[PDB]
Amino acid sequence: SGFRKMAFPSGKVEGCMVQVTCGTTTLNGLWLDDVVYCPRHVICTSEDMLNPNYEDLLIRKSNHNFLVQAGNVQLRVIGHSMQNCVLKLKVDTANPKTPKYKFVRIQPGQTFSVLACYNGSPSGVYQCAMRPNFTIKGSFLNGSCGSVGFNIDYDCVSFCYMHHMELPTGVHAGTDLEGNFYGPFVDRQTAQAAGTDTTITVNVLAWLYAAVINGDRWFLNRFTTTLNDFNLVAMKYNYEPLTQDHVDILGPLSAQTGIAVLDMCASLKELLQNGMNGRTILGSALLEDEFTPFDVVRQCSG
Amino acid sequence: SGFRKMAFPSGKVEGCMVQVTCGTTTLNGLWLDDVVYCPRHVICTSEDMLNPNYEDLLIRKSNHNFLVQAGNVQLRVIGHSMQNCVLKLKVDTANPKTPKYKFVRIQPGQTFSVLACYNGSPSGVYQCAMRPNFTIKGSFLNGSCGSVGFNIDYDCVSFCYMHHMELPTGVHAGTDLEGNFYGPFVDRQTAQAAGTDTTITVNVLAWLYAAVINGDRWFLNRFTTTLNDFNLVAMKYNYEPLTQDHVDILGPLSAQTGIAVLDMCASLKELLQNGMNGRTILGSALLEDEFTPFDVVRQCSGVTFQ
Ligand SMILES: N#Cc1ccccc1CN1CCCN(C(=O)c2cncc(Cl)c2)CC1
Ligand SMILES: N#Cc1ccccc1CN1CCCN(C(=O)c2cncc(Cl)c2)CC1
Ligand SMILES: [Cl-]
Ligand code: NA
C-alpha cells in the first residue's frame, strides 16, 4: 500500500551527464554515443541573449572553444552543429555508459522524471508533468540548463525534455532532444509569459482511482453522468475536456475498482462543486493532476 | 525557483541491488563489497512468522540454501551470519560498483530517498521522512522487502533504512543497516500498531522559510511568541514540541530571510488557527512537514526573492 510521487531510477541517465563550457558560461550536456547535446544558448554572452543570431555566433567558434568534462576527464570536441535550439558537439570518445535510448516528444498531460544537474553533476531527481500551457513546474536554479527529462519503457530510456529557461512566474520551459521548444517560447531574453493553465482531467481521475485502490473511498457516490454533461462542468472549473480516448485509457482502473469512468466523473463533479469539506484524499487537500493512468497502474499493480 | 520533493539520484544504489532467494521466498538484498544485506525474515515460512526462533531457523541452513542473483549472474554464498534483524551473506565476488558508503541510524524528522525494488530490480525513487512514531509513509507492495533508504550528501551514500513490513494502517516499518528496528516494532506477525503520529514542527518551519526565500510572505504577522507558549499551542494541534536544538538549527534560514525563529513560530500558530483561506504555500493547501532545514538549504536559492 501507499502512493507517492515516484520518479524512474536515474542511474542510466546519470552516466550520460557532462559539463559543457563555452567562454565564461558553464552548463550541462547529455553524452550519448559520440555526441554531446546541450542548449544552443551556451554560445551566447548576456548581451547576445537580447537578439542572438545563432548561426552567426556559431561560425565564430572552433571545436577547441567548447570544453566538455565527463567526471574528471576532458573530452575532445571534433565537430559542432545545431539542430533547432540544441547544439550537437561531436566528441572523439563514444560514451561507454550509453544506455539503450530514443528521443521522443511528449504531449501535455504526460509525466516524466527530471534529473536536475549542476556543472555536469546530478543533484536530484523528481517527477514533473508537461502542463497544458507547455510549461513544467520544476525546481531549478542558475546552472541547471541542459538538465534532462525522461521515461524508462523497459530497459530503454526515452529522453523527452532538456531544460532551457525559467519564466517570470517561476515555471520552466525547454525543448525536446531534437531542439523543438514545448510551447510558444524562444531562446532569447525578450518578454515571455506562461499562458493560463488548466487542470489535467484524465490525470485527476487516475489519482481518484489510486485513492480508491489505497482505501480512500469517502468521495464515491451513487450517481453517474454523461460525457457531455461532465464536460460542461469541467469547462466551468478550467479543467481540460475529457474525450472518449481518456475514458478508454481509464478502462482497466475502472474494471479493477468496479467504478465506471462516468461514475468517477460524477464524484469529481461533486468535488468541484462542493469542495472536500475538510477532508483529504491520499493526504492532499487539492485534486492532484500529475499522475497519468499509466503511472497509477505501474505503481499500484507493479 | 520552484520547490519539489526531490530525491537523490539513485544510480549509486541501483548498482548494489540484488535478489535473495531462500526456499520459496524471494526478496531484495544490498550488495556492498563482498556482503549482501537482507531482512532475516527471508528464512521464515508464513507459519514461522507468528513466533519465529531465528537462531533455530538459521542453524538449519547451509550457504548453498541462499541463492543470490545480481542481474543475470548467480553469486556464490560462502558465509552467513545474523546481526539483529538483518542477515549478512558473505559472497565470493566483491561488488565492482560499490560506492563510497556508510551506515547511519537516523532520528525522527530526518528525510531520505527510497529506491523501491522488486526481484532485485529498481522500480522507482521517492523521498520519505522518519515519522515521530518511527514509521515511514512509503509506497511498497509485496516483494519490496529489502528495498533501502539513503542520503548522498557529497559522493558518499549513507544507508539509513531497510524495508521489512507494512503495518495495519498502511504505513511502513524497517531497520537501520545494522538490523535494529526503528520504533518498538519486531519482525513477527503479532498485533503491533503504529502509535499516534504527530506533525514534524521543525520541518514545517523550514518549509515556511523555503516559501519566504521563494518570494511568498502572505502568512507572516506582526507578532512573536515565547518558545513555551508556542509549544503549548502546537501540542493542541498534534505538532511535535520545538526544542532549543530546533531553534538553533533554523538559525541559517532565519539569517537569510531576516525573520527571527520565534517570529516564524507566531506565523505557524496563526496558520494553525485560521487555515489558509483558499491560498496555497509552495503549491500546497496543507502545511508540509517532510522537508528538513538541511533539505531547504540544499534546494533553495542562497538569495531570497525580496
Ligand atoms: N533559452 C533561453 C532563455 C530565454 C529567456 C531568458 C533567459 C534564457 C537563458 N537563460 C540564460 C542561462 C542561465 N539560466 C539558468 O541557468 C536558469 C535555469 N533555470 C532556472 C533558473 Cl532560476 C536559471 C537562465 C536561462
Ligand atoms: N519483518 C516483518 C513482518 C512483521 C509483521 C508482519 C509481516 C512481516 C513480514 N512480511 C512478510 C514478507 C512479505 N511482505 C512484503 O513483501 C510487503 C512489504 N511491504 C508492503 C507490503 Cl503490502 C508487503 C510483508 C512483510
Ligand atoms: Cl538524523
Ligand atoms: Na458515482
UniProtKB/Swiss-Prot annotation, chain B:
<protein>
    <recommendedName>
        <fullName>3C-like proteinase nsp5</fullName>
    </recommendedName>
</protein>
<comment type="function">
    <text>Cleaves the C-terminus of replicase polyprotein at 11 sites. Recognizes substrates containing the core sequence [ILMVF]-Q-|-[SGACN]. Cleaves and inactivates human TRMT1, preventing tRNA guanine(26)-dimethylation of tRNAs. May cleave human NLRP1 in lung epithelial cells, thereby activating the NLRP1 inflammasome pathway. May cleave human GSDMD, triggering alternative GSDME-mediated epithelial cell death upon activation of the NLRP1 inflammasome, which may enhance the release interleukins 1B, 6, 16 and 18. Also able to bind an ADP-ribose-1''-phosphate (ADRP).</text>
</comment>
<feature type="cross-link" description="Glycyl lysine isopeptide (Lys-Gly) (interchain with G-Cter in ubiquitin)">
    <location>
        <position position="90"/>
    </location>
</feature>
<feature type="active site" description="For 3CL-PRO activity">
    <location>
        <position position="145"/>
    </location>
</feature>
<feature type="active site" description="For 3CL-PRO activity">
    <location>
        <position position="41"/>
    </location>
</feature>
<feature type="domain" description="Peptidase C30">
    <location>
        <begin position="1"/>
        <end position="306"/>
    </location>
</feature>
<comment type="subunit">
    <text>3CL-PRO exists as monomer and homodimer. Only the homodimer shows catalytic activity. Interacts with host FBXO22; this interaction promotes the proteasomal degradation of nsp5.</text>
</comment>
<feature type="topological domain" description="Cytoplasmic">
    <location>
        <begin position="1"/>
        <end position="306"/>
    </location>
</feature>
<feature type="cross-link" description="Glycyl lysine isopeptide (Lys-Gly) (interchain with G-Cter in ubiquitin)">
    <location>
        <position position="5"/>
    </location>
</feature>
